[PDB]
Design a protein around this nucleic acid. Sequence first.
DNA 1: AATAAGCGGAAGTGGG
DNA 2: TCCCACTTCCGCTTAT
Length: 95
Amino acid sequence: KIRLYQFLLDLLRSGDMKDSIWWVDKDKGTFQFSSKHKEALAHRWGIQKGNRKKMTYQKMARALRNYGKTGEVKKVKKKLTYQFSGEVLGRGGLA
DNA sequence: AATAAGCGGAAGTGGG
DNA sequence: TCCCACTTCCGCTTAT
Ligand code: NA
């Protein structure tokens, strides 16, 4: 099963949910979710995973928080805004 | 208050 | 056994 950070990077590449998530500074890997449309994106994550319950943005963000220590995704000091690591960005484009 | 978001411990579930 | 990679639940805090 795909990892959450990869699901998000792939969405940003495809633009399929551009009203729910977007790059802020793609060269730096900063991205942001829509206040009003993030739940639809969270629902898609849960369905992709086949989880028992309906996924919510809150649960998805709780998972994102666990990447802060290992570094794949860090929370930036703006609402609903995060930053991928250089490792995630480089390996992603190469893959 | 109403609404929204942030913080994050802890217990539960997957798939090795 | 026991970690992976989250998921789910819960109580608390901050927004300015
Ligand atoms: Na605010």
